[PDB]
Write a protein that binds this ligand. Structure first.
Ligand SMILES: Nc1nc2c(ncn2[C@@H]2O[C@H](COP(=O)(O)OP(=O)(O)O)[C@@H](O)[C@H]2O)c(=O)[nH]1
Lengths: 56, 420
């Protein structure tokens, strides 16, 4: 019974670390999508500025 | 549902109205025939749109004026009322004898036009303060319509006489006689004077030959921006009444100042990336406003700013706070947080950012002071007074008008100098 309890708690801790690494995957994806967002918005800003200034 | 009739008057008022209607047609994507490509326009058979405006004047010249310019076919002949003579730069000839017999008829064309709306947010007038026709008729009409619909507000997009660069010799009499009555039954007297318009069009756009078309177009842009935040959705919406509530502390300190942003020429257009703080630095500059009165020479009782386009509201509010806080002297103390903001969601035609600034400020009593100076100088000698006293006018009304003007300027001074 001691061996079984040890094995079960080991598996539970493994599941914990697995979910933690899942959340870290998600966080890195979030950061990179935010960088995509900001660069695309910068190019859109340059586009609107050209459109407004060349408006003679 | 919050509609606005657009009453005009006089030659200047009529030209400004035509320019404003064509600019609004440009914004709302209409063509000079009235086909798409309820607050201002009205629907009409065959998908056509007709402006909800009336056009009054004693001389039929302005009739051909608003016919000649583009977008002249948007209007309807039922709203072309026109006398024959023309008051010829005489105030009383548009307020007592000759103008009267028109205003009655005009009342009709208003009463079968206002009730056409269902929830009328108020009127708006476009006229001059010196010309006899515009000033006199608009004053009588303001009287009548305030007697009729006291619940609605009546903006008066008025162009005060050019203070120093005078084109006529009878400005002060007309301006004083008209203001004496305008101060009673008006709610938003936004003053404009051609001195400031030439100043802007010279020292901010380096233009070659500024004709009246360009000044009318600029005042048109400001006029549109004043209520475009109502015409469209936004993150923080306003109207014609929120402005009034946030702009006047007492029932007769309601005379405003107007400013537009941004404005540059091609040389400067190449430079100066477009960003909200630059817009603030442009709008809160002295010479960047439609009134020849350096606003530093007075205190801002209160001031609202309507933005158009997409931006970050935090930047707007933080710039407003920074500018009201750093220059605390030019602003007034006994009222706190005296600046106001609003933000629309659709900017003008290809203009990523647009700001319209309206400010009730005691720096405009100087204009009335100098106009009354000219008046009392021309009245001590009874100069050019027979032209008026021959038409039923007496000489007591002039003293009453000047004393009311001085009471107004004394109110400005007194409740500027107050403290807490
Ligand atoms: N921005 C602008 N100002 C004008 C115009 N016409 C006149 N003004 C000025 O307004 C004053 C006289 O107004 P006016 O319209 O001629 O008098 P009215 O004939 O009774 O309507 C004068 O100071 C003119 O210089 C115009 O078309 N546009």
């Amino acid at each position: 019974i001691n061996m079984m309890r040890g094995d079960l708690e080991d598996n539970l801790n493994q599941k914990r670390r697995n979910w933690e690494k899942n959340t870290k995957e998600f966080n890195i994806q979030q950061r990179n999508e935010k960088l995509d967002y900001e660069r695309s918005s910068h190019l859109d800003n340059q586009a609107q500025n050209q459109y407004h200034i060349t408006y003679c | 549902m919050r509609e606005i009739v657009h009453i005009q008057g006089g030659q200047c008022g009529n030209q400004i109205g035509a320019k404003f209607w064509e600019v609004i047609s440009d914004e709302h994507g209409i063509d000079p025939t009235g086909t798409y490509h309820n607050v201002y326009y009205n629907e009409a058979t065959g998908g056509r749109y007709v402006p909800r405006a009336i056009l009054m004047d004693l001389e039929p010249g302005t009739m051909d004026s608003v016919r000649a310019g583009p977008f002249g076919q948007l209007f309807r002949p039922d709203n072309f009322v026109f006398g024959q003579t023309g008051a010829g730069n005489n105030w009383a000839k548009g307020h007592y004898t000759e103008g009267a017999e028109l205003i009655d008829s005009v009342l009709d064309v208003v009463r079968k036009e206002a009730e056409g709306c269902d929830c009328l947010q108020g009127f708006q007038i476009t006229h001059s303060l010196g010309g006899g026709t515009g000033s006199g008729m608009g004053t009588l009409l303001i009287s009548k319509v305030r007697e009729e619909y006291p619940d609605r507000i009546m903006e008066t997009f008025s162009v005060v006489p050019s203070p120093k660069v005078s084109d006529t010799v009878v400005e002060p009499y007309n301006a004083t006689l008209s203001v004496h009555q305008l101060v009673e039954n008006a709610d938003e007297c936004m003053v404009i004077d051609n001195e400031a318009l030439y100043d802007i069009c010279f020292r901010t756009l380096k233009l070659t030959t500024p004709t009246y078309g360009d000044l009318n177009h600029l005042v048109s842009a400001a006029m549109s921006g004043v209520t475009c935040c109502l015409r469209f959705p936004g993150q923080l919406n306003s109207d014609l009444r929120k402005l009034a509530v946030n702009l006047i502390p007492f029932p007769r300190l309601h005379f405003f100042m107007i400013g537009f942003a941004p404005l540059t020429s091609r040389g400067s257009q190449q430079y100066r990336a477009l960003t909200v703080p630059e817009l603030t630095q442009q709008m809160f500059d002295a010479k960047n406003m439609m009134c020849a009165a350096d606003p530093r020479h007075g205190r801002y009782l209160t001031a609202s700013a309507l933005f158009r386009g997409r931006m970050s509201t935090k930047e707007v509010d933080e710039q407003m706070l920074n500018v009201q806080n750093k220059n605390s002297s030019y602003f007034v103390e006994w009222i706190p947080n005296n600046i106001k903001s609003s933000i629309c969601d659709i900017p003008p035609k290809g203009l990523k950012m647009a700001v319209t600034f309206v400010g009730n400020s005691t720096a405009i009593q100087e204009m009335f002071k100098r106009v009354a100076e000219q008046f009392t100088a021309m009245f001590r000698r009874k100069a050019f007074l027979h032209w008026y006293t021959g038409e039923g006018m007496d000489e007591m009304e002039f003293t009453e008008a000047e004393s009311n003007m001085n009471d107004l300027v004394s109110e400005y001074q007194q409740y500027q100098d107050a403290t807490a």
